[PDB]
C-alpha cells in the first residue's frame, strides 16, 4: 500500500459558508454523506469542495470532531502507515492510535479518545474533509 501521490495537500484556501458541520481554529470541516470505502475517500474529499483534502485529526481538534456525532455513527480519518511505523496524516506529524489489527484504515466514534484501527475496510462509512479559511 502507498498514498496515491496525486491527492496531496491544498496550497489554496476556500470553505463554503453554507453547508459545513462545524468550524474550529480557522478550518471548515465537512462530514460526507455518501459512505465511501476508506481507500476511495482520498478522491471523495477532493471531489466535494475545492481546496479540500482527506484529513486526520490532531489531539486538540479531536474532542470537537467527536462531539458533533451521534451515538452509533462512525467516521473514517486520514492516518496511515506508508512504512513500518510513524502513523502520519497528509498534513504531517505523528499521532497515537489504539492498534489492534493492521493495514491502514482508521476510524473514530463518539466514545473514542484517539483514532482507532479497523480490520476489513471494505466497509462503507462517511468521511471527514477539511479546508482552511481565508487567512492563509
Amino acid at each position, epitope marked *: 500500500f502507498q498514498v496515491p501521490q*496525486n491527492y*496531496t495537500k*491544498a*496550497n*489554496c*484556501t*476556500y470553505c*463554503n*459558508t*453554507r*453547508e459545513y458541520t462545524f468550524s474550529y481554529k480557522g478550518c471548515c470541516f465537512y462530514f460526507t*454523506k455518501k459512505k465511501h470505502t476508506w481507500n476511495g475517500c482520498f*478522491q471523495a474529499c*477532493a*471531489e*466535494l*469542495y*475545492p*481546496c479540500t483534502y482527506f484529513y486526520g485529526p490532531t489531539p486538540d481538534i479531536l474532542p470537537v470532531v467527536t462531539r458533533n456525532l451521534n451515538a452509533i455513527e462512525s467516521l473514517w480519518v486520514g492516518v496511515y502507515r506508508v512504512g513500518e511505523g510513524n502513523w502520519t496524516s497528509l498534513d504531517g506529524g505523528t499521532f497515537k492510535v489504539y492498534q489492534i489489527f493492521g493495514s491502514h484504515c482508521t476510524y473514530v466514534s463518539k466514545f473514542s479518545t484517539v483514532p482507532v484501527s479497523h480490520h476489513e475496510c471494505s466497509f462503507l462509512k462517511p468521511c471527514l474533509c477539511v479546508s482552511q479559511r*481565508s487567512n492563509s
Partner: antibody, heavy 113, light 112 residues
Framework: QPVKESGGRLVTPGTPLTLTCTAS????????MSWVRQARGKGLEWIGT?????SAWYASWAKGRFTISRTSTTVELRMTSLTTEDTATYFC??????????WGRGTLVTVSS | DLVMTQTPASVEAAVGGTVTIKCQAS??????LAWYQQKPGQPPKLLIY???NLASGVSSRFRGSGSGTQFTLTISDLECADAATYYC??????????????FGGGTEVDVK
C-alpha cells in the same frame, strides 16, 4: 507561466469546435477549472465549471450545447451549434479566487458564416 | 438562477478622489463575492476576494465591504492607472447540490 490556451480558429456554424487549456508548472489534478467568455466590450459571462475525475456543471445559458471535459494533462471544451452571437474571447482559470488565482490570456473564438 | 446588478453604469470623479460601486444580489450570498479590474485587451486582475480581503498587489486603497445581499467597493484616491471596467463576481461550489457563479454588468470609470 499561467495557463495558456489555443484553438480559436474562426469557423462556420453547426460544426464541432475544440478548446485546449493546457498546464504550466502547477498540477492540474489539484484545482478545479472553469470557463468564462466575453464578447466584444461587454460583461463577461460564465460557461461552466468542471472538477477532476468526471463531474461537471454548466450555466442555463446553454442546454447542453457545451460539453466541458477533464483529462489529467489538460482540460478541453466542445461546442456543437455555435451561432451568430456566440463570438467571444474564451478564458479558463482556477476556480477558488484568492492568492492562487491565475487567468490565461484568452483565445478569440469568433464565428464566421 | 442568481443575478447580479451594478446600478452605477458609468461614473466620473476627481484625480486622487473617491468612487463607490454598488453590487446587489437577489438572495443571500452570505459573504462570498469578488472584484476584478480589467484594462483593455488584458485578463482581469483579481483585486479582492471574499468581500473584503486583498490579493497581492492591491494597496489598501482599494477596499470594499458589505454583508448579506448588498455590497460595495470603495477606491481611496484615483490615479492614472485606475480607469477600467470593474466587475463583481459571486461564487458557489457545492459538489452535492449545485455549482454556479454569476458575474455582473460592468462599471466603466474615468478621471478628469
Amino acid at each position: 507561466q499561467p495557463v495558456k490556451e489555443s484553438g480559436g480558429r474562426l469557423v462556420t456554424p453547426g460544426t464541432p469546435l475544440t478548446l485546449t487549456c493546457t498546464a504550466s508548472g502547477f498540477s492540474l489534478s489539484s484545482y478545479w477549472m472553469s470557463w468564462v467568455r466575453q464578447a466584444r466590450g461587454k460583461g463577461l459571462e460564465w460557461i461552466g465549471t468542471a472538477t477532476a475525475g468526471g463531474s461537471a456543471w454548466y450555466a442555463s445559458w446553454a442546454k447542453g450545447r457545451f460539453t466541458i471535459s477533464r483529462t489529467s494533462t489538460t482540460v478541453e471544451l466542445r461546442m456543437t451549434s455555435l451561432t451568430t452571437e456566440d463570438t467571444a474571447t474564451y478564458f479558463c482559470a482556477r476556480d477558488p479566487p484568492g492568492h492562487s488565482g491565475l487567468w490565461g490570456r484568452g483565445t478569440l473564438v469568433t464565428v464566421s458564416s | 438562477d442568481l443575478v447580479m446588478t451594478q446600478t452605477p453604469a458609468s461614473v466620473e470623479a476627481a484625480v486622487g478622489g473617491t468612487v463607490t460601486i454598488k453590487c446587489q444580489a437577489s438572495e443571500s450570498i452570505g459573504n462570498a463575492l469578488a472584484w476584478y479590474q480589467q484594462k483593455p485587451g488584458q485578463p482581469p486582475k483579481l483585486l479582492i476576494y471574499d468581500t473584503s480581503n486583498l490579493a497581492s498587489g492591491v494597496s489598501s486603497r482599494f477596499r470594499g465591504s458589505g454583508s448579506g445581499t448588498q455590497f460595495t467597493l470603495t477606491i481611496s484616491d484615483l490615479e492614472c492607472a485606475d480607469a477600467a471596467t470593474y466587475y463583481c463576481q459571486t461564487y458557489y461550489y457545492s459538489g452535492v447540490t449545485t455549482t454556479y457563479q454569476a458575474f455582473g454588468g460592468g462599471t466603466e470609470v474615468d478621471v478628469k
